[PDB]
Scaffold this motif. Structure first.
Motif, PDB file in Angstrom:
ATOM      1  N   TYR A  38       4.178  -1.755   2.811  1.00 28.83           N
ATOM      2  CA  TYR A  38       3.865  -0.191   2.350  1.00 28.83           C
ATOM      3  C   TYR A  38       4.576   0.331   2.366  1.00 28.83           C
ATOM      4  CZ  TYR A  38       5.127   2.126   6.967  1.00 28.83           C
ATOM      5  OH  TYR A  38       6.066   2.324   8.287  1.00 28.83           O
ATOM      6  N   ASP A  88       1.951  -6.724   7.087  1.00 23.04           N
ATOM      7  CA  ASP A  88       1.558  -5.546   5.717  1.00 23.04           C
ATOM      8  C   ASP A  88       2.258  -4.405   5.262  1.00 23.04           C
ATOM      9  OD1 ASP A  88      -1.224  -6.406   6.222  1.00 23.04           O
ATOM     10  OD2 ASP A  88      -1.132  -5.424   8.398  1.00 23.04           O
ATOM     11  N   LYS A 119      -3.453   1.151  -3.375  1.00 20.68           N
ATOM     12  CA  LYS A 119      -2.406  -0.721  -3.341  1.00 20.68           C
ATOM     13  C   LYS A 119      -2.371  -0.164  -4.218  1.00 20.68           C
ATOM     14  CE  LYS A 119      -7.126  -2.668  -1.518  1.00 20.68           C
ATOM     15  NZ  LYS A 119      -8.734  -2.859  -2.259  1.00 20.68           N
ATOM     16  N   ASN A 173      -5.031   5.845   0.497  1.00 18.06           N
ATOM     17  CA  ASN A 173      -4.166   4.427   0.919  1.00 18.06           C
ATOM     18  C   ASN A 173      -4.691   4.390  -1.142  1.00 18.06           C
ATOM     19  OD1 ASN A 173      -2.408   4.459   3.279  1.00 18.06           O
ATOM     20  ND2 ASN A 173      -4.232   3.944   3.798  1.00 18.06           N
ATOM     21  N   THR A 191       7.034   7.253   1.857  1.00 18.87           N
ATOM     22  CA  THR A 191       5.909   7.870   0.954  1.00 18.87           C
ATOM     23  C   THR A 191       7.100   9.715   1.886  1.00 18.87           C
ATOM     24  OG1 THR A 191       4.748   8.149   2.577  1.00 18.87           O
ATOM     25  CG2 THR A 191       4.025   7.187   0.065  1.00 18.87           C
ATOM     26  N   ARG A 226       1.021  -1.240  -0.014  1.00 17.26           N
ATOM     27  CA  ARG A 226      -0.151   0.140   0.181  1.00 17.26           C
ATOM     28  C   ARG A 226       0.604   1.143  -0.323  1.00 17.26           C
ATOM     29  NH1 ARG A 226       0.029   1.493   6.037  1.00 17.26           N
ATOM     30  NH2 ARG A 226       0.146  -0.476   6.936  1.00 17.26           N
ATOM     31  N   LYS A 227      -0.060   2.631  -0.440  1.00 18.67           N
ATOM     32  CA  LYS A 227       1.122   3.523  -0.616  1.00 18.67           C
ATOM     33  C   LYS A 227      -0.146   4.450  -0.537  1.00 18.67           C
ATOM     34  CE  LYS A 227       3.932   6.568  -4.220  1.00 18.67           C
ATOM     35  NZ  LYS A 227       4.057   6.510  -5.052  1.00 18.67           N
ATOM     36  N   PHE A 228       0.711   5.326   0.489  1.00 18.73           N
ATOM     37  CA  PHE A 228      -0.136   6.750   1.225  1.00 18.73           C
ATOM     38  C   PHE A 228       0.002   7.552  -0.090  1.00 18.73           C
ATOM     39  CE2 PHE A 228      -1.247  10.256   3.458  1.00 18.73           C
ATOM     40  CZ  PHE A 228      -2.719   9.822   3.803  1.00 18.73           C
TER      41      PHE A 228
END
Ligand SMILES: CCCc1ccc(N2N[C@@H](C(=O)O)C[C@@H]2C[C@@H](N)C(=O)O)cc1
Lengths: 278, 275
Positions: free
Chosen positions: A74, A72, A49, A47, A77, A33-35
């Motif tokens: 991520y 999880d 995917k 967020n 950023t 996941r990437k904010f």
């Protein structure tokens, strides 16, 4: 609890980021996941995917199976690998330091400054400060007098790095005049520096050994070469960063040493790192 | 309170020379003018003079971490493998590994290879030297390397081996793919690297599989010897300490700092790199 928050950073071929298949993550990849910010004047975001794969992602899959944990994943950023700005860490190291992640997986170099605030795995791929040149150019390495005393030669060697990273900081501390001279040849990025080398605008490019070895292995025409591994300066490696005093360190270390000894690591290098060029 | 350091004879990392009748050590400098720091080592009962790459590192670690030391050579002359105790299900380590685990030594300062087998029982530093495995032969002997037919299909006409009770001995014994090569080597393995290197010159041993940091130095000093020039496996040397030793963290930090210092580069230029 054996479910862990893990942070990574995109840098091919170690961590490659894709979008979901138009809606899951295709095989060989893992969910990450990437904010994503709404704009640059707000902390608000969404967020998203993504799908992550590559050399270090394959490491993480092996570790999750052997050490028996779920995760999880991520993407970082704020920052990249890890930089201390006014005694405050950003990047992957900051995620571990401030306990938003218990583990960092990626092209993360083991150094002394970071090891004071995080625990590092054993290195799983060797790296350091290396030099890339066009085939035929004769340099011994970072400590070459052609770099240390550039004006002892006419014409002077044209060489640089990508500033604001670990490479520039090391040269600034170790070779003050070399740093003063080479800022005139600052490169905006790795891809920029490769073009300057292949077009004769630059004589040498000083950067991370693992990245330079990967780039030379796939260079079109095999025109770009790196120095021999015995001449890499400040030999270290990529490692997994964990929270200080983490209980996972020992079994992560034994797993990686097992992968190295039984040929699993060499297979991943063949799969992701070794190129066609000699 | 004085740290007991164990080491092993292995040029260019550890030189061992007789003492002067004064009991002190001959004062020398390198060809480039730097002082050759020497410490007294005890070994097989007799005081001797020890110096080299790992001695320079030990002096740096001691000055940085503010501890004193006394150096002795490993009694059985081996690096260390784990063996079965006869008529028993117990296992014990020999070499420097056994001395560290039993308490005869508090720290291993030597070209000690980091591997999973030893890491189960002791704590390794971050690597102070990255290198690998290669093959040393006499000039005139022509093999392609680890995959040469005379090595993959061994016979008594071409004898190759490594050092007994070493990391290389471990590496070939553990891999299913090296079962044939290991069967040949275990009949011919040597008690020390120096004896094996001398056997290559005397044409009694035809190929020596050993550490690249050592074999390449040997080839650079002895014109009758050459290596494959190829690394077929990469590994690192680390300082060895017992589990939960109080010096583990700062030793690793000093090694990382020394790599980034250019200090390890200075040691590499002084001891390792040649023509
Ligand atoms: C510790 C001394 C040895 C050394 C190893 C690698 C580097 N490179 N230079 C960075 C850069 O200039 O952008 C990038 C990379 C470090 C990177 N992987 C990171 O984790 O920050 C520098 C020094």
């Amino acid at each position: 609890d054996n479910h862990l928050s893990i942070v990574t950073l995109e840098e091919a071929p170690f961590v490659i980021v894709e979008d979901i298949d138009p809606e899951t993550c295709v095989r060989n990849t893992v969910p990450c996941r990437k904010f994503v910010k709404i704009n640059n004047s707000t902390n608000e975001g969404m967020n998203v995917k993504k799908c992550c794969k590559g050399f270090c992602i394959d490491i993480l899959k092996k570790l999750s199976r052997t050490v028996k944990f779920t995760y999880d994943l991520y993407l970082v950023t704020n920052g990249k690998h890890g930089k201390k700005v006014n005694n405050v860490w950003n990047g992957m190291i900051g995620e571990v330091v401030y306990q938003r992640a218990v583990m960092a997986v990626g092209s993360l170099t083991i150094n002394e400054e970071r090891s004071e605030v995080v625990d590092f795995s054993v290195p799983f791929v060797e790296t350091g400060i290396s030099v890339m040149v066009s085939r035929g150019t004769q340099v011994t390495g970072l400590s070459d007098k052609k770099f240390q005393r550039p004006h002892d030669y006419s014409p002077p060697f044209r060489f640089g790095t990508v500033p604001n990273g670990s490479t520039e900081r090391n040269i600034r501390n170790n070779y003050p005049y070399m740093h003063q001279y080479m800022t005139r040849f600052n490169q905006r990025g790795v891809e920029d520096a490769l073009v300057s080398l292949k077009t004769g605008k630059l004589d040498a490019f000083i950067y991370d050994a693992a990245v330079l070895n990967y780039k030379a292995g796939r260079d079109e025409g095999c025109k770009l070469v790196t120095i021999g591994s015995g001449y890499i300066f400040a030999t270290t490696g990529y490692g997994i960063a964990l929270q200080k005093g983490s209980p996972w360190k020992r079994q992560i270390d034994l797993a990686l040493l097992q992968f190295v000894g039984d040929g699993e690591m060499e297979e991943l290098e063949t799969l992701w790192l070794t190129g066609i060029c000699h | 309170t004085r740290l007991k350091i164990v080491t092993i004879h292995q040029e260019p990392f550890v030189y061992v020379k007789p003492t002067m009748s004064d009991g002190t050590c001959k004062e020398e400098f390198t060809v480039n003018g730097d002082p050759v720091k020497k410490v007294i080592c005890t070994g097989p009962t007799v005081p001797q003079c020890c110096y080299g790459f790992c001695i320079d590192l030990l002096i740096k670690l001691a000055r940085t971490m503010n501890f004193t030391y006394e150096v002795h050579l490993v009694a059985d002359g081996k690096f260390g493998t784990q063996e079965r105790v006869n008529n028993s299900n117990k296992k014990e380590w020999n070499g420097m590994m056994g001395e560290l685990l039993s308490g005869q030594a508090d720290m291993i300062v030597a070209p000690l290879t980091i591997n999973n087998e030893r890491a189960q029982y002791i704590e390794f530093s971050k690597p102070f030297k990255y290198q690998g495995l290669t093959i040393l032969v006499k000039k005139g002997t022509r093999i392609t390397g680890i995959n040469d037919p005379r090595l993959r299909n061994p016979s008594d006409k071409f004898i190759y081996a490594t050092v007994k009770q070493s990391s290389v001995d471990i590496y070939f014994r553990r891999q299913v793919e090296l079962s044939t090569m290991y069967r040949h080597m275990e009949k011919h393995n040597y008690e020390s690297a120096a004896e094996a290197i001398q056997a290559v010159r005397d044409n009694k041993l035809h190929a020596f599989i050993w550490d690249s940091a050592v074999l390449e130095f040997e080839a650079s000093q002895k014109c009758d010897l050459v290596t494959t020039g190829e690394l077929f496996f990469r590994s690192g040397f680390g300082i060895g300490m017992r589990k939960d030793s109080p010096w583990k963290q700062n030793v690793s930090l000093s090694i990382l700092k020394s790599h980034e210092n250019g200090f390890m580069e200075d040691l590499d230029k002084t001891w390792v790199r040649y023509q």
